[PDB]
Amino acid sequence: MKVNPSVKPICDKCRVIRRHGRVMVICSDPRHKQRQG
Amino acid sequence: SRIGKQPVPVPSGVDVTINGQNLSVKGPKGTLTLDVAEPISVSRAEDGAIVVTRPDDERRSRSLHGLSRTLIANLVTGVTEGYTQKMEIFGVGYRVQLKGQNLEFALGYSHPVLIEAPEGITFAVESPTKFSVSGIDKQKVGQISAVIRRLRRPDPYKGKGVRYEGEQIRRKVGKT
Amino acid sequence: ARKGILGTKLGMTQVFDENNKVVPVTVVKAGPNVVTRIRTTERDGYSAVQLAYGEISPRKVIKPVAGQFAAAGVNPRRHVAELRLDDEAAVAEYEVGQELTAEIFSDGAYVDVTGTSKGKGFAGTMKRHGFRGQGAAHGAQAVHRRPGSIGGCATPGRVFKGTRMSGRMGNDRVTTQNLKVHKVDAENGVLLIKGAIPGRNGGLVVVRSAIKRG
Amino acid sequence: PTYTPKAGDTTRSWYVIDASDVVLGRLASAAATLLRGKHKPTFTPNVDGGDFVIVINADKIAVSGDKLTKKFAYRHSGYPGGLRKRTIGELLEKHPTRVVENAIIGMLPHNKLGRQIQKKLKVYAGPDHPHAAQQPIPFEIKQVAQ
RNA sequence: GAUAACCGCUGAAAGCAUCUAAGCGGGAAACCUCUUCCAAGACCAGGCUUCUCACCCUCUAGGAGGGAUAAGGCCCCCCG
RNA sequence: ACCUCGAUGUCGGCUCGUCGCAUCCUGGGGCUGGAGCAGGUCCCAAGGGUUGGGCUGUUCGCCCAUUAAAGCGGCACGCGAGCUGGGUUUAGAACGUCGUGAGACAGUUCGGUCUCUAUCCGCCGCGCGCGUCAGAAGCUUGAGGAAACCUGUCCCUAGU
Ligand SMILES: [Mg+2]
Ligand SMILES: [Mg+2]
Ligand SMILES: [Mg+2]
Ligand SMILES: [Mg+2]
Ligand SMILES: [Mg+2]
Ligand SMILES: [Mg+2]
Ligand SMILES: [Mg+2]
Ligand SMILES: [Mg+2]
Ligand SMILES: [Mg+2]
Ligand SMILES: [Mg+2]
Ligand SMILES: [Mg+2]
Ligand SMILES: [Mg+2]
Ligand SMILES: [Mg+2]
Ligand SMILES: [Mg+2]
Ligand SMILES: [Mg+2]
Ligand SMILES: [Mg+2]
Ligand SMILES: [Mg+2]
Ligand SMILES: [Mg+2]
Ligand SMILES: [Mg+2]
Ligand SMILES: [Mg+2]
Ligand SMILES: [Mg+2]
Ligand SMILES: [Mg+2]
Ligand SMILES: [Mg+2]
Ligand SMILES: [Mg+2]
Numbered sequence A: 001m002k003v004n005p006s007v008k009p010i011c012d013k014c015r016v017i018r019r020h021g022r023v024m025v026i027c028s029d030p031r032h033k034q035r036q037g
Numbered sequence B: 001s002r003i004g005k006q007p008v009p010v011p012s013g014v015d016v017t018i019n020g021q022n023l024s025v026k027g028p029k030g031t032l033t034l035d036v037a038e039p040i041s042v043s044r045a046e047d048g049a050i051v052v053t054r055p056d057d058e059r060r061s062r063s064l065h066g067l068s069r070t071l072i073a074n075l076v077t078g079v080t081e082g083y084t085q086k087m088e089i090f091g092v093g094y095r096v097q098l099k100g101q102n103l104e105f106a107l108g109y110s111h112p113v114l115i116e117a118p119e120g121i122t123f124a125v126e127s128p129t130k131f132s133v134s135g136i137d138k139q140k141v142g143q144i145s146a147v148i149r150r151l152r153r154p155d156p157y158k159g160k161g162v163r164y165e166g167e168q169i170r171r172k173v174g175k176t
Numbered sequence C: 001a002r003k004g005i006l007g008t009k010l011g012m013t014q015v016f017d018e019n020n021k022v023v024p025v026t027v028v029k030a031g032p033n034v035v036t037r038i039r040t041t042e043r044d045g046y047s048a049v050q051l052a053y054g055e056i057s058p059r060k061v062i063k064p065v066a067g068q069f070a071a072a073g074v075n076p077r078r079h080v081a082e083l084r085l086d087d088e089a090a091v092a093e094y095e096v097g098q099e100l101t102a103e104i105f106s107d108g109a110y111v112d113v114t115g116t117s118k119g120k121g122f123a124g125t126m127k128r129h130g131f132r133g134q135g136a137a138h139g140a141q142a143v144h145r146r147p148g149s150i151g152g153c154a155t156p157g158r159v160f161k162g163t164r165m166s167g168r169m170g171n172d173r174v175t176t177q178n179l180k181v182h183k184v185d186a187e188n189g190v191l192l193i194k195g196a197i198p199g200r201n202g203g204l205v206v207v208r209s210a211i212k213r214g
Numbered sequence D: 001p002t003y004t005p006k007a008g009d010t011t012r013s014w015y016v017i018d019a020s021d022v023v024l025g026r027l028a029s030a031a032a033t034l035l036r037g038k039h040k041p042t043f044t045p046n047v048d049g050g051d052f053v054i055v056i057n058a059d060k061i062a063v064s065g066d067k068l069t070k071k072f073a074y075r076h077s078g079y080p081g082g083l084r085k086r087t088i089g090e091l092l093e094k095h096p097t098r099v100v101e102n103a104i105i106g107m108l109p110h111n112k113l114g115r116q117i118q119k120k121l122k123v124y125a126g127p128d129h130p131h132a133a134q135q136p137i138p139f140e141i142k143q144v145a146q
Numbered sequence E: 001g002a003u004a005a006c007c008g009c010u011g012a013a014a015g016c017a018u019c020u021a022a023g024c025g026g027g028a029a030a031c032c033u034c035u036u037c038c039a040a041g042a043c044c045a046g047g048c049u050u051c052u053c054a055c056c057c058u059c060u061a062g063g064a065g066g067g068a069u070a071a072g073g074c075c076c077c078c079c080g
Numbered sequence F: 001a002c003c004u005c006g007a008u009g010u011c012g013g014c015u016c017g018u019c020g021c022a023u024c025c026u027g028g029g030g031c032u033g034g035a036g037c038a039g040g041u042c043c044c045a046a047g048g049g050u051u052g053g054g055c056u057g058u059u060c061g062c063c064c065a066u067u068a069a070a071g072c073g074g075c076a077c078g079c080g081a082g083c084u085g086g087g088u089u090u091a092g093a094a095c096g097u098c099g100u101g102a103g104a105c106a107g108u109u110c111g112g113u114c115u116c117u118a119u120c121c122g123c124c125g126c127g128c129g130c131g132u133c134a135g136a137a138g139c140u141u142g143a144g145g146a147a148a149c150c151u152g153u154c155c156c157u158a159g160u
């Protein structure tokens, strides 16, 4: 899971949310899990 | 929104009780109680429904509308038909048995593990590989099911562990 | 419940177990204690038992202490302490007047022994704090046993309360814990504990059950 | 000239303030007001001539926003690294009273007279107090319109 | 016990979906109890209890001042 | 070139620490081009721990035997009214080089005085006085603090 200042939907199965004050991108692919920090 | 805009069916055998913003549902399987949100309104439509209505379209009430609607629906269905979860095991030597009302897992640890079914939940093994968990509460059944599910690390190589019934695990193979 | 008793440290010697291994023992006279008072939450705010040990002449007892013993109904003793209990069901079995001896303990029982350690006078940082000294040769000038630096320059500009310096040492409450009771001489009112006990000979110790190994 | 109190000029009144579902800052500011004596026309900044204040139900104080988890009370023990922090949350069920009184102490003057003034504050976490003998008249948190 | 990262449950807004938005959980040598020691000059100076619980004089009768005592202690003495 | 030239002592080592976390070990995880063993990377985590020698004035650094690991930093590049004095920076002498010379060299070599009875704050201990609405004594509650916290190997589980 990346923790980077910029998170983007790498693939079309990814989708961006705000959970507990953080922008996250969540996909069915575990490699694409990614959040801001 | 639209889901929060339609009332919940109540069957001819299930009786409801409304007091203040609190309510309860009683049916063949058991009884349940629930509390309804503040800005939302809950009404007994005597023509056979419970109507959940938002006074306005502010985002808070717009949000709590469907939430409260689904809470009432889950309450009623849980008291009428109950909530059951089928859940399977995979691997050689990964086995399931019972002990009193508790359900015991032997999943390749150097010690056995066993889970005590908490209140309103009854475990029921139907095969050393296949077992089910049932209850009057949708949230409790799901939570204890998830607790069972995560007694092993995910296995993308052999798949061994506790899987749900209808779940298709992802699996990647190491080169050896 | 956490049992305990007051006694004196007689001395220490050695014994050989059945498997023929020498065991250093401190010998404690866990002589008779009368319980003189009960402390209860309903009245005092906590549950504890006040018990008295020793032999003392009534001529040497001050009138308030003699009166506090008369209200109990027991002859005065030299030392008075109390056991902190935990609940009221623990103090249900203590009644003002009754007795307790070394037979409260047994073989293999782990006990915590509280004593007061020996006085070491005004001690320096090497004895007191295990400081490394400084060189005995190679030019060291009159600093062979001194602490040296006690802070930093101008920031913070002070010496950080808690700095380890030299002063009075010893004479402190010390609890040595998980000490095995090798053997209770029941008839002679003695008990033999494997290990060392704080204090001088003929000093008051409190031998309690162990909480870590009970 | 201007009135200054003589020896037997100060009279003390006993106020009980209920703290159930009241804002902590509002309650503390009012209690500081009628603890210092700012409501008396005979006020004089030299003299400690306020009133006694009992705060009842200091448990039920209301703290707005999200301060029950991210607001802290810091103490320092004087030793290097001797700083400890307790949230408003922990402080409300460890022992609650000081929370309320903490606020009031921060709005009294930090001088010797403020130390004398503090002694008139009686905070109780329960709904009842032992001072029924002084007939404490209930006090309502009122605002004067303009 | 409460949590960090992390893992979730039930779930709208947004007919499907999502650990969150309403609510409910798991979660570390870090934090809070826990173990040890100091601790009421903690000025909110605490609690339980025992002992003594008395005897005169002056100034001018309002308060103060002086003195002899109790319970107790201190010094002197023999020591550690 | 802002304070200090009617004086703010300059490197390294010793003693004693103290704080940060930008984590070296130990603890919790997500992703792997992660089968296991062992890793890579990122995230959380500062409680404790973090060796002895050879070479060198050494810091740095090179190496030797270990270790769970041999972390990086701030504090007047912490610490000389606490130590040292190998380095550097007087005066002696010599080499090389420059200079006609006197002499000079971010060139080298050998030698070369490290003062102070602690006033105040600070800190480590120890008493005397008054206070806690009479005077005393025994036992105590604890708000609030301080201390401590490290870790390996072997064997069963399982040659699973
Ligand atoms: Mg990128
Ligand atoms: Mg030495
Ligand atoms: Mg000298
Ligand atoms: Mg010498
Ligand atoms: Mg200096
Ligand atoms: Mg300073
Ligand atoms: Mg849904
Ligand atoms: Mg969703
Ligand atoms: Mg203090
Ligand atoms: Mg007292
Ligand atoms: Mg006396
Ligand atoms: Mg200029
Ligand atoms: Mg200047
Ligand atoms: Mg200068
Ligand atoms: Mg000068
Ligand atoms: Mg000077
Ligand atoms: Mg000067
Ligand atoms: Mg230092
Ligand atoms: Mg970090
Ligand atoms: Mg770290
Ligand atoms: Mg790790
Ligand atoms: Mg990893
Ligand atoms: Mg800790
Ligand atoms: Mg050398």
Ligand SMILES: [Mg+2]
Pocket (backbone or CB within 6 Å): none
């Ligand atoms: Mg350092």
Ligand SMILES: [Mg+2]
Pocket (backbone or CB within 6 Å): F077
């Ligand atoms: Mg320096």
Ligand SMILES: [Mg+2]
Pocket (backbone or CB within 6 Å): F077, F078
């Ligand atoms: Mg430094």
Ligand SMILES: [Mg+2]
Pocket (backbone or CB within 6 Å): F080
């Ligand atoms: Mg120096």
Ligand SMILES: [Mg+2]
Pocket (backbone or CB within 6 Å): F080, F114
């Ligand atoms: Mg010097």
Ligand SMILES: [Mg+2]
Pocket (backbone or CB within 6 Å): none
């Ligand atoms: Mg030299």
Ligand SMILES: [Mg+2]
Pocket (backbone or CB within 6 Å): none
């Ligand atoms: Mg010369």
Ligand SMILES: [Mg+2]
Pocket (backbone or CB within 6 Å): none
């Ligand atoms: Mg020439």
Ligand SMILES: [Mg+2]
Pocket (backbone or CB within 6 Å): none
């Ligand atoms: Mg405490």
Ligand SMILES: [Zn+2]
Pocket (backbone or CB within 6 Å): A010, A011, A012, A013, A014, A027, A028, A029, A032
């Ligand atoms: Zn994706």
